[PDB]
PDB file of C-alpha atoms and ligand atoms in Angstrom:
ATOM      1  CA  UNK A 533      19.760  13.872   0.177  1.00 29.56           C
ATOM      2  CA  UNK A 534      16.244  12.142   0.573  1.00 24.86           C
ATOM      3  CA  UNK A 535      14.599  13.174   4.376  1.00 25.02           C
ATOM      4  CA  UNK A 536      10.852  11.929   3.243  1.00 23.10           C
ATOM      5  CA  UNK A 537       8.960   9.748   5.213  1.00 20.42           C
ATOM      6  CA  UNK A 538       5.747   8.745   7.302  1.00 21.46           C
ATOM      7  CA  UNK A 539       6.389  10.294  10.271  1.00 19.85           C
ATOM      8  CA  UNK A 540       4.831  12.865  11.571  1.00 21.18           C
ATOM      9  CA  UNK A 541       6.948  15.688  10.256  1.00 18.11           C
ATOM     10  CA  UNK A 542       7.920  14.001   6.534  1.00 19.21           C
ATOM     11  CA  UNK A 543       5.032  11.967   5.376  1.00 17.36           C
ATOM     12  CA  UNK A 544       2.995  12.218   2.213  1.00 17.73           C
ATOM     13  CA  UNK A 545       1.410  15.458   2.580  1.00 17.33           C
ATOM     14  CA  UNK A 546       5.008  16.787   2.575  1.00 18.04           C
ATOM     15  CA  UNK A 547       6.476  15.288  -0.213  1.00 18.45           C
ATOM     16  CA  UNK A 548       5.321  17.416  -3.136  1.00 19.85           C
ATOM     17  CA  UNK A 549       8.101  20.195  -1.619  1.00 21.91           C
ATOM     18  CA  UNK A 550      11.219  18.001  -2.860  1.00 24.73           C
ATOM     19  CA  UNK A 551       8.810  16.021  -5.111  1.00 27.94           C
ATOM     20  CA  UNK A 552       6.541  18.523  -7.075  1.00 26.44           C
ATOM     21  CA  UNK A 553       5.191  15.729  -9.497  1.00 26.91           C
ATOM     22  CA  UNK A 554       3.677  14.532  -6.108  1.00 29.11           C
ATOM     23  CA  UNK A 555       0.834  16.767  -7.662  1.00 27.66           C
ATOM     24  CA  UNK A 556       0.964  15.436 -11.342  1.00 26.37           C
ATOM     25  CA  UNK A 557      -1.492  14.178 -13.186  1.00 24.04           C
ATOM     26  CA  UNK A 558      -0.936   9.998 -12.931  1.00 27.06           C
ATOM     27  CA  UNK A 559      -0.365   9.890  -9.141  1.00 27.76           C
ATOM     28  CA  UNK A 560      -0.392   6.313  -7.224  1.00 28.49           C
ATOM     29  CA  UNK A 561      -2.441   5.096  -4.919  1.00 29.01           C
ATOM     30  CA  UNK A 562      -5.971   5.606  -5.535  1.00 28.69           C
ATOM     31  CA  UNK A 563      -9.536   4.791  -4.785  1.00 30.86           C
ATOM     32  CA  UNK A 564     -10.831   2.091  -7.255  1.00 29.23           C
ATOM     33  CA  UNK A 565     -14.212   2.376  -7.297  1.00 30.07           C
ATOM     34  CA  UNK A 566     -15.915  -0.628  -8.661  1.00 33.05           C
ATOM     35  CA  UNK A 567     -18.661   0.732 -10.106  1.00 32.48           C
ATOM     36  CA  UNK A 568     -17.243   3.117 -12.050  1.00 32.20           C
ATOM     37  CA  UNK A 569     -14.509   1.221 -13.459  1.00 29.89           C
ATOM     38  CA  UNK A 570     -15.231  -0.414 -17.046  1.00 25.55           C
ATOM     39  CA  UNK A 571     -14.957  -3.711 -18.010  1.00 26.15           C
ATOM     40  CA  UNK A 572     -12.559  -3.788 -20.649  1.00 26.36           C
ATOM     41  CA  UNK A 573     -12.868  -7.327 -23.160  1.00 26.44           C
ATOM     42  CA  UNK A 574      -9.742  -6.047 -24.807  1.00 22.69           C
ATOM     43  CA  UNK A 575      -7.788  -6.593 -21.820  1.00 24.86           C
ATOM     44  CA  UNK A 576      -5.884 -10.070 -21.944  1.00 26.92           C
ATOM     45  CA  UNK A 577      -5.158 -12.856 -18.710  1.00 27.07           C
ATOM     46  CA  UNK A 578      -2.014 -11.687 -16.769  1.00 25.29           C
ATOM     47  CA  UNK A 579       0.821 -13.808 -17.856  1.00 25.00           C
ATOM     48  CA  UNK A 580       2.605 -13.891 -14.486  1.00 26.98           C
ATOM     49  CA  UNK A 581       5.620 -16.233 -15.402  1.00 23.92           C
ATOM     50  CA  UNK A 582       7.739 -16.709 -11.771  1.00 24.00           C
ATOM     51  CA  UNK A 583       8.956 -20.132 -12.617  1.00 22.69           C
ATOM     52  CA  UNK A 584      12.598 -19.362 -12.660  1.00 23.41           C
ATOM     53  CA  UNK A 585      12.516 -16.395 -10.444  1.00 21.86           C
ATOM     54  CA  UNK A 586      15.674 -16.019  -8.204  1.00 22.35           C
ATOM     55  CA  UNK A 587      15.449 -13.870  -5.146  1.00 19.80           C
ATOM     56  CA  UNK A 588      18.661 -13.139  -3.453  1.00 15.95           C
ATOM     57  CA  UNK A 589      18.313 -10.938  -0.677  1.00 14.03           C
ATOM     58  CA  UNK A 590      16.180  -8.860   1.565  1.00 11.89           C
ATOM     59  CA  UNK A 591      16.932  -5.275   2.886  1.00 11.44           C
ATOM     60  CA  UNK A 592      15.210  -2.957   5.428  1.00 11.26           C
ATOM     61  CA  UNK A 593      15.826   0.418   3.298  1.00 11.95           C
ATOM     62  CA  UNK A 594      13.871   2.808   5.940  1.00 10.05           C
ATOM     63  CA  UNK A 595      11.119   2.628   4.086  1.00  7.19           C
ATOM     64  CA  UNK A 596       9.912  -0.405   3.964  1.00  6.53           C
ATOM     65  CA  UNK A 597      11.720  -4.142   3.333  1.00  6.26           C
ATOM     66  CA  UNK A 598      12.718  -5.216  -0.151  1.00  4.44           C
ATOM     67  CA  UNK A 599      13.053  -9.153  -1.403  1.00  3.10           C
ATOM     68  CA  UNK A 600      15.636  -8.517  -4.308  1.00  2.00           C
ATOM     69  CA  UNK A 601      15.822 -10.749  -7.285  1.00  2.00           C
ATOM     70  CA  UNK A 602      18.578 -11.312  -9.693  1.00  2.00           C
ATOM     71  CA  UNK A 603      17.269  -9.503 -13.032  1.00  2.00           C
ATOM     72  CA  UNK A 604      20.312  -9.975 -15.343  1.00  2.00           C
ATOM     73  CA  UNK A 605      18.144 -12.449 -17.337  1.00  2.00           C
ATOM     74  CA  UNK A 606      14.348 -12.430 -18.122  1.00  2.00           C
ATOM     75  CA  UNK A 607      13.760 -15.222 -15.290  1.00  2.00           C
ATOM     76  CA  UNK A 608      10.514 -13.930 -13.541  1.00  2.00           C
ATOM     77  CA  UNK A 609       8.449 -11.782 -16.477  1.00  2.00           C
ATOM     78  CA  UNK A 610       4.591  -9.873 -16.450  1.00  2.00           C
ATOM     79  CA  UNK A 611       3.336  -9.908 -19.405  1.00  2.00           C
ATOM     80  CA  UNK A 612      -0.046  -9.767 -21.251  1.00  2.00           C
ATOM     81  CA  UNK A 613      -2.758  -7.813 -19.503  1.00  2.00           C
ATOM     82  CA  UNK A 614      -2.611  -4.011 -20.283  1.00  2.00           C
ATOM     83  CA  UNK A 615       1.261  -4.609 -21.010  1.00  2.00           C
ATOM     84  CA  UNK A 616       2.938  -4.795 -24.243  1.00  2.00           C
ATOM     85  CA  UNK A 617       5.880  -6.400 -24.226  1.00  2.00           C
ATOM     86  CA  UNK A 618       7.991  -7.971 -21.140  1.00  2.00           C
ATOM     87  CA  UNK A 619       8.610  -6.778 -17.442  1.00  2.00           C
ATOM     88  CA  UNK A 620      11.138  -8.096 -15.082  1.00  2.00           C
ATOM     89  CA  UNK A 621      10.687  -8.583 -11.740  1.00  2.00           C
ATOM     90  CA  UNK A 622      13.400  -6.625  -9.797  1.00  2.00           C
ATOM     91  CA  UNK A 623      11.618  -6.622  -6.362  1.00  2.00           C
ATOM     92  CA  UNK A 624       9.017  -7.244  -4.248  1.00  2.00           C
ATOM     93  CA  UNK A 625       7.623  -5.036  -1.245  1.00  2.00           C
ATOM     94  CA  UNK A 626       4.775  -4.330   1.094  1.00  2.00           C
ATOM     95  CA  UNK A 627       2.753  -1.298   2.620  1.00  2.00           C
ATOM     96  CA  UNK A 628       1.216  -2.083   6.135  1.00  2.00           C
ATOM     97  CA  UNK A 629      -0.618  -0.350   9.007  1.00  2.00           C
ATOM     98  CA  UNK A 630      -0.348  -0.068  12.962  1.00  2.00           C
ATOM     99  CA  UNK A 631      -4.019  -1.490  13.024  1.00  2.00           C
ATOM    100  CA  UNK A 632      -5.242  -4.039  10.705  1.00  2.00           C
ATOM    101  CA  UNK A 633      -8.147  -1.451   9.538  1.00  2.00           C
ATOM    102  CA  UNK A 634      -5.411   0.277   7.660  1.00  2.00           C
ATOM    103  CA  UNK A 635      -2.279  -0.306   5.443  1.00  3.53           C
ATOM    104  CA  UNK A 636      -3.017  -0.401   2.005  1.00  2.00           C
ATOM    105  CA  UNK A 637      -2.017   2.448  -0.630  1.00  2.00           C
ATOM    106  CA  UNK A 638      -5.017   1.642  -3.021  1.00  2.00           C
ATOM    107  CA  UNK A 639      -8.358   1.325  -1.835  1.00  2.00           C
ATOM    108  CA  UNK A 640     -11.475  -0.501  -2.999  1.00  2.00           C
ATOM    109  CA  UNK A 641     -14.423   1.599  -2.770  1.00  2.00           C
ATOM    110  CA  UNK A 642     -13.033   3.609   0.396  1.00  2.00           C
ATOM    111  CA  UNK A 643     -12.119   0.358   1.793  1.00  2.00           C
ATOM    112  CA  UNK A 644      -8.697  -0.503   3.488  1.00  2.00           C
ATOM    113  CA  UNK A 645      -6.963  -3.343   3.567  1.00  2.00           C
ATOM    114  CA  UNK A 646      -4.734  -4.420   6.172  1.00  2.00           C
ATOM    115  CA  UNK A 647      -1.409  -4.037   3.919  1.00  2.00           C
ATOM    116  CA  UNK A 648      -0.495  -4.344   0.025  1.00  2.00           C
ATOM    117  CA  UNK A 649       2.228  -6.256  -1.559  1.00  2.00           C
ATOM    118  CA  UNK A 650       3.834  -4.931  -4.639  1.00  2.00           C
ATOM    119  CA  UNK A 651       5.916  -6.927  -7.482  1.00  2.00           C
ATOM    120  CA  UNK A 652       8.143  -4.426  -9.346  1.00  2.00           C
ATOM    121  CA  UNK A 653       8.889  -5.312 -12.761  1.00  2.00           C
ATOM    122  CA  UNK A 654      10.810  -3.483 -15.391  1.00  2.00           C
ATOM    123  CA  UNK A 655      10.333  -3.211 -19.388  1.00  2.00           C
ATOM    124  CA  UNK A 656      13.066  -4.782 -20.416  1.00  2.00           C
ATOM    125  CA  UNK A 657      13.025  -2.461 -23.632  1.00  2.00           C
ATOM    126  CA  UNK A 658      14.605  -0.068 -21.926  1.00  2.00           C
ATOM    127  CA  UNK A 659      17.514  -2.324 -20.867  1.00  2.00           C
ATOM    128  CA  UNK A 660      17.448  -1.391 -16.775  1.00  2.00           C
ATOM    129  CA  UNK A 661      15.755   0.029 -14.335  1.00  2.00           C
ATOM    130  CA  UNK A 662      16.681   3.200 -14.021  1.00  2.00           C
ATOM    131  CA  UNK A 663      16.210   3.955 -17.711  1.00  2.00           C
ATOM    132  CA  UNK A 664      12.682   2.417 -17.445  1.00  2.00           C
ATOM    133  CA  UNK A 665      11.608   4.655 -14.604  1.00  2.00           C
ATOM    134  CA  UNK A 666      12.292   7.635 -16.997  1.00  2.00           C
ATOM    135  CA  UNK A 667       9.512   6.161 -19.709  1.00  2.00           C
ATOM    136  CA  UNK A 668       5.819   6.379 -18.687  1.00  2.00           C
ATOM    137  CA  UNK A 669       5.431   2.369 -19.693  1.00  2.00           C
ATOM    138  CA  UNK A 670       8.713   1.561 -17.884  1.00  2.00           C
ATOM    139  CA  UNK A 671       7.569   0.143 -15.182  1.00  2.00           C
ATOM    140  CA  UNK A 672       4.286  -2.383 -14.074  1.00  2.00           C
ATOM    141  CA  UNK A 673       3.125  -3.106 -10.516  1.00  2.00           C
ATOM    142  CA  UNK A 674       1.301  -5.929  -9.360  1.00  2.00           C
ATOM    143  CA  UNK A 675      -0.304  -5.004  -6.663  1.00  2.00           C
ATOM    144  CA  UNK A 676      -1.888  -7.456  -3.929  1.00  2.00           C
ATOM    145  CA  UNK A 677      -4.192  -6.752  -1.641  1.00  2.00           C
ATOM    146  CA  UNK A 678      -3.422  -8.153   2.554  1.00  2.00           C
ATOM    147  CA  UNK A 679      -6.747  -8.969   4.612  1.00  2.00           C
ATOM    148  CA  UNK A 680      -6.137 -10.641   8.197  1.00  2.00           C
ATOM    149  CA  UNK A 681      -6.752 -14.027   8.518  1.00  2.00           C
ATOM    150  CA  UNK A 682      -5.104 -17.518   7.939  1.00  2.00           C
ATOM    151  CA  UNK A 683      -2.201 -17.331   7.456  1.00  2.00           C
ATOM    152  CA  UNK A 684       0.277 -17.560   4.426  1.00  2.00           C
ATOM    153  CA  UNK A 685       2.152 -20.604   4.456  1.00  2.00           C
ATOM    154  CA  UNK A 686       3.911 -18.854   0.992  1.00  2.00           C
ATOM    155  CA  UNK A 687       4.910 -15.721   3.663  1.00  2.00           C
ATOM    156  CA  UNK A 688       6.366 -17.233   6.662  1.00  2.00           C
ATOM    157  CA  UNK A 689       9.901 -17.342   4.867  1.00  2.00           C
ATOM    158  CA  UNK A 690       9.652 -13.869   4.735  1.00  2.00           C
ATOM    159  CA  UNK A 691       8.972 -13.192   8.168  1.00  2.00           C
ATOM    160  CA  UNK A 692      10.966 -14.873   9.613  1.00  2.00           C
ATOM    161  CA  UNK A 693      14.281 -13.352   8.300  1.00  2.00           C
ATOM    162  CA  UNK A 694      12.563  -9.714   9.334  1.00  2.00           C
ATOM    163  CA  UNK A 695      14.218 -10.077  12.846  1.00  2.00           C
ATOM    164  CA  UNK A 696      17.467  -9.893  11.501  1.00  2.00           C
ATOM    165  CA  UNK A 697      17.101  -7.059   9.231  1.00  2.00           C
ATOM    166  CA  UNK A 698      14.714  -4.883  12.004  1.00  2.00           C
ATOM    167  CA  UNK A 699      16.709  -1.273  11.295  1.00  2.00           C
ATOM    168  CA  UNK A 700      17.479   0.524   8.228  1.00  2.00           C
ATOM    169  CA  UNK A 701      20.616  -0.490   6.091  1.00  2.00           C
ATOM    170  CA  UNK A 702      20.532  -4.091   7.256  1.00  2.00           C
ATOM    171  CA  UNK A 703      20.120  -7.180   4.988  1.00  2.00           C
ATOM    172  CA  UNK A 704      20.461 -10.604   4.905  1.00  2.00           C
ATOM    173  CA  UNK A 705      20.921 -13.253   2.175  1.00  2.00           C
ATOM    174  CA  UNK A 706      17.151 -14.545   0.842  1.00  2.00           C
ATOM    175  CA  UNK A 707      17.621 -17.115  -1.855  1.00  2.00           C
ATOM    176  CA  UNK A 708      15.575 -19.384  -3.058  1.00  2.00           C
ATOM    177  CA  UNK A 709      12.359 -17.680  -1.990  1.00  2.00           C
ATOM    178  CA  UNK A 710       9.425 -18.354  -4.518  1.00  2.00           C
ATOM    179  CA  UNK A 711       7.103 -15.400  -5.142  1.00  2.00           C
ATOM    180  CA  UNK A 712       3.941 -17.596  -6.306  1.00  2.00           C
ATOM    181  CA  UNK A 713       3.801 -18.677  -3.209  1.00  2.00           C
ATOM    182  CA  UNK A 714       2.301 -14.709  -2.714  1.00  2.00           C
ATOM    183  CA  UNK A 715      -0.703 -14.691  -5.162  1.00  2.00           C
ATOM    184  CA  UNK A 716      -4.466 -15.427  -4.891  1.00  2.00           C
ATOM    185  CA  UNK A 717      -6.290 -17.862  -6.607  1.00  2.00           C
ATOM    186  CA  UNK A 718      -8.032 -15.207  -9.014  1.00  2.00           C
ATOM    187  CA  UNK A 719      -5.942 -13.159 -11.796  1.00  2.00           C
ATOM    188  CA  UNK A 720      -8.632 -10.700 -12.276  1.00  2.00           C
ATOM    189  CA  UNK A 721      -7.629  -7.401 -12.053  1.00  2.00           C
ATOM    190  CA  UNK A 722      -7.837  -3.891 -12.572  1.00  2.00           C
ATOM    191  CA  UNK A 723      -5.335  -1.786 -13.971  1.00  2.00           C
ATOM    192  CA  UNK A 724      -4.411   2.509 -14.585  1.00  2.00           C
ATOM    193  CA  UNK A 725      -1.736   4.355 -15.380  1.00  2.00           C
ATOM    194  CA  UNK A 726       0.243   5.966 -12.217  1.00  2.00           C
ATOM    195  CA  UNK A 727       3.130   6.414 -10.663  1.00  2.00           C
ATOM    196  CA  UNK A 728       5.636   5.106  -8.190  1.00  2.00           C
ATOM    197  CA  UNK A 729       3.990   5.458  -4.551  1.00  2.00           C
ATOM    198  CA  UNK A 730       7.328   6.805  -3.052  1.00  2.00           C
ATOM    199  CA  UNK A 731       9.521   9.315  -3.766  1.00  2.00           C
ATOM    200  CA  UNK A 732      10.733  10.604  -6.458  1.00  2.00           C
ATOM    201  CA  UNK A 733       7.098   9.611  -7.252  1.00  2.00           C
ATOM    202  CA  UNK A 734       7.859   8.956 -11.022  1.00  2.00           C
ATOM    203  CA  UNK A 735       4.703   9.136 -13.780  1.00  2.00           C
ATOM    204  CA  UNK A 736       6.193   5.566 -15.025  1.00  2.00           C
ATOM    205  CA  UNK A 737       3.793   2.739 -14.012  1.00  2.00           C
ATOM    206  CA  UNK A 738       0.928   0.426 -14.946  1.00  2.00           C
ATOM    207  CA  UNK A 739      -1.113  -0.733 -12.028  1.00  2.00           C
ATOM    208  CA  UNK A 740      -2.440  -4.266 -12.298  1.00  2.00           C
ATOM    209  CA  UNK A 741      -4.003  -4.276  -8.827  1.00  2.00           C
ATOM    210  CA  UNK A 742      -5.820  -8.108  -8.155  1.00  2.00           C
ATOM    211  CA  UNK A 743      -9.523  -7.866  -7.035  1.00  2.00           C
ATOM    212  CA  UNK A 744      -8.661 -11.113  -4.455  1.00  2.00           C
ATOM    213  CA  UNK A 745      -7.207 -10.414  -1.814  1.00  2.00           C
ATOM    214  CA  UNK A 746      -4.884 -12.697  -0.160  1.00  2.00           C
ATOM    215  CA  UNK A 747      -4.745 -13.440   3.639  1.00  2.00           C
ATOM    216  CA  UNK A 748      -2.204 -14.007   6.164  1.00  2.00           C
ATOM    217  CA  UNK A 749      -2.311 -14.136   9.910  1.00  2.00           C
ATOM    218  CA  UNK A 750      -2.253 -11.583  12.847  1.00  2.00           C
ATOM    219  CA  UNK A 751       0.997 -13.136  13.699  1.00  2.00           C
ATOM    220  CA  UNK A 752       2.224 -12.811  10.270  1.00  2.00           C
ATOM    221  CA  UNK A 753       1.618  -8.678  10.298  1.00  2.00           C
ATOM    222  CA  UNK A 754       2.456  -7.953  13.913  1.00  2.00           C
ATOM    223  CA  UNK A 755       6.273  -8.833  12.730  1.00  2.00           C
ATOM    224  CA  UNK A 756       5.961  -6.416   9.875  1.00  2.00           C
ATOM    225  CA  UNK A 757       4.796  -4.067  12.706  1.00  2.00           C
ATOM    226  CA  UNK A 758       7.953  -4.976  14.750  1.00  2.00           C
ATOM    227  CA  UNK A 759      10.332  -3.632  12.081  1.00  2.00           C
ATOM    228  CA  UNK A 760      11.840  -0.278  12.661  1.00  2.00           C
ATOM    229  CA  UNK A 761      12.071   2.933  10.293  1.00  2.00           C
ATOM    230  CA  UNK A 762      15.406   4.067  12.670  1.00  2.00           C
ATOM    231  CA  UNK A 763      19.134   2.966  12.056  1.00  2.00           C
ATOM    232  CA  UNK A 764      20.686   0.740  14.416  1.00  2.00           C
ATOM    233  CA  UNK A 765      20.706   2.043  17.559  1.00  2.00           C
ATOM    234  CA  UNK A 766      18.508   5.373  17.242  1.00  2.00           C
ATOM    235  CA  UNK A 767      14.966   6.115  18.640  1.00  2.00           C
ATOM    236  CA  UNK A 768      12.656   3.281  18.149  1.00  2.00           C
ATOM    237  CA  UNK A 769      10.298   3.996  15.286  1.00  2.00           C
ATOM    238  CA  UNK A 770       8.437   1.062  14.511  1.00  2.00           C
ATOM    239  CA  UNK A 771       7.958   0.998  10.858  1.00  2.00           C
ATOM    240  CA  UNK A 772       3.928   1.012  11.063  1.00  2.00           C
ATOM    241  CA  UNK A 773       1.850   3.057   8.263  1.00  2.00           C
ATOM    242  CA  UNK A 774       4.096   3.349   5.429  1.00  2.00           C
ATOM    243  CA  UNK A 775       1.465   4.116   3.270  1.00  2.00           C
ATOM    244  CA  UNK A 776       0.490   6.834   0.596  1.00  2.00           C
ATOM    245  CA  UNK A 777      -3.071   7.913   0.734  1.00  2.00           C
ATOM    246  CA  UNK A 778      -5.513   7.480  -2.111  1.00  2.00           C
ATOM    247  CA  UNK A 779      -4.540  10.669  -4.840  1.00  2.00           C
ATOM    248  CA  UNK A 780      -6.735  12.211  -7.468  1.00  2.00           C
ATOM    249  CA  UNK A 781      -7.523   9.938 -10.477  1.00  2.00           C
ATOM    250  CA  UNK A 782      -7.555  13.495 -12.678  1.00  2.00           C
ATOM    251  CA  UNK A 783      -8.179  12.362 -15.794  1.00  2.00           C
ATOM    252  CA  UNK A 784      -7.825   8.527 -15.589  1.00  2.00           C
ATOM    253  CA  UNK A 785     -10.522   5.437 -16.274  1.00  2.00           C
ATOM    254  CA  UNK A 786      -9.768   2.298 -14.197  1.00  2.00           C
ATOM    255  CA  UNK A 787     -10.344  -0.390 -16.189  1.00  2.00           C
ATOM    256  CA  UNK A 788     -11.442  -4.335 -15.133  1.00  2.00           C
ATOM    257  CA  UNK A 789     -10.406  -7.609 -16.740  1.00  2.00           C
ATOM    258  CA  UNK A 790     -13.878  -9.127 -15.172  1.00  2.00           C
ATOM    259  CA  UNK A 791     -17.291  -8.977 -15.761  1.00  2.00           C
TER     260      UNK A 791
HETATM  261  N1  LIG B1002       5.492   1.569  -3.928  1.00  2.00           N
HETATM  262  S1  LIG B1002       5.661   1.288  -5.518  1.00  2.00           S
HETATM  263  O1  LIG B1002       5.121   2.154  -6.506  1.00  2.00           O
HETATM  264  O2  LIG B1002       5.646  -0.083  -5.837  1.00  2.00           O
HETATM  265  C1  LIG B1002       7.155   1.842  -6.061  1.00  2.00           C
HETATM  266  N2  LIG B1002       7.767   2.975  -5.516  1.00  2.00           N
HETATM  267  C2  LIG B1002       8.940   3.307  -6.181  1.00  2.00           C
HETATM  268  C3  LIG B1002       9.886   4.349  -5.939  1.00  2.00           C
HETATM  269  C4  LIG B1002      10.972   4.409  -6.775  1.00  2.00           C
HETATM  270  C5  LIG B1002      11.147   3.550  -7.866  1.00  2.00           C
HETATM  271  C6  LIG B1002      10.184   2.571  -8.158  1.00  2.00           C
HETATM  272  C7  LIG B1002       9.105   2.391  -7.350  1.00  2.00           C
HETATM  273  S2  LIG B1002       7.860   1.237  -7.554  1.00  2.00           S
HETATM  274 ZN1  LIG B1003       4.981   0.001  -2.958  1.00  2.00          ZN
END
């Protein structure tokens, strides 16, 4: 079974052993640099549709913590953008640091951002999830950057269950929570092709990564900094730096939806 991680034995500079597309071609995160990357007039608004979008839980999975929504029915959708067709939102994640000068998977000209939120949708052509990760448009991330500041009023819900799923394998019931209540002002973006930024690391994703970040407190991270990696009653790990550094864009163009 799976013994990957980001610790100091098992992190991201091990991975490609059990993972060898860990050095593929369309590997997540990586450096946006906004100078380089073209503004592309073909590119359409992000339809972000999260109206009817029904969270039910929230797990600590070792990795990181996952909000879970019911995707049985096309109730929270991405579409437009770089995307043709529809993508369900299945989940909902962040990457964080141990200091707020680091956390985020992509960058922004060399620049770190305190953490990154991801929205995991699903193209619901290929009926579920696991068949979409197997298709190189099966999957599209929206990904968010974190900077410290004031805080998220849209967040706190969130936080506050974290104390009672601190170890790996616990969850707890999260209905009701609304995602919107996660995104910036701004829908500009840019957007590549990639992959999933854990293991297995699958070539199946288009990045839509917003240029505004949003903000959230210093209380609001230091509880993501209080969960743990361990199980129930192991070594304290504090789950701190569960991050993939920046990979080679290879033979990609990052493309903007702004001027
Ligand atoms: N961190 S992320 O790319 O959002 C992500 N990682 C994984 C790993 C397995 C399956 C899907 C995803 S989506
Ligand atoms: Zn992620």
């Amino acid at each position: 079974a799976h013994h990957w991680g980001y610790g100091k034995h098992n992190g991201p500079e091990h991975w490609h052993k059990d993972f060898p597309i860990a050095k593929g071609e369309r590997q997540s995160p990586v450096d946006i640099d906004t100078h380089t990357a073209k503004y592309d007039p073909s590119l359409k608004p992000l339809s972000v549709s999260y109206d009817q979008a029904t969270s039910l839980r929230i797990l600590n999975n070792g990795h990181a913590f996952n909000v879970e929504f019911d995707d049985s029915q096309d109730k929270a959708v991405l579409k437009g953008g770089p995307l043709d067709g529809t993508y369900r939102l299945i989940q909902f994640h962040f990457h964080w640091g141990s200091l707020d000068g680091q956390g985020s998977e992509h960058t922004v000209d060399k620049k770190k951002y305190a953490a990154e939120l991801h929205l995991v949708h699903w193209n619901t052509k290929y009926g579920d999830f696991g068949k979409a990760v197997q298709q190189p448009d099966g999957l599209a991330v929206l990904g968010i950057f974190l900077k410290v500041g004031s805080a998220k009023p849209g967040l706190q819900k969130v936080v506050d269950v974290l104390d009672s799923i601190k170890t790996k394998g616990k969850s707890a019931d999260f209905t009701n929570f609304d995602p919107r209540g996660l995104l910036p002002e701004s829908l500009d973006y840019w957007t590549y092709p990639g992959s999933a930024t854990t293991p297995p690391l699958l070539e199946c994703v288009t990045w839509i990564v917003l240029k505004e970040p949003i903000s959230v407190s210093s209380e609001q991270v230091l509880k993501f900094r209080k969960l743990n990696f361990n199980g129930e009653g192991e070594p304290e790990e504090l789950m701190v730096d569960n991050w993939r550094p920046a990979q080679p864009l290879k033979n990609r163009q990052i493309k903007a939806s702004f001027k």
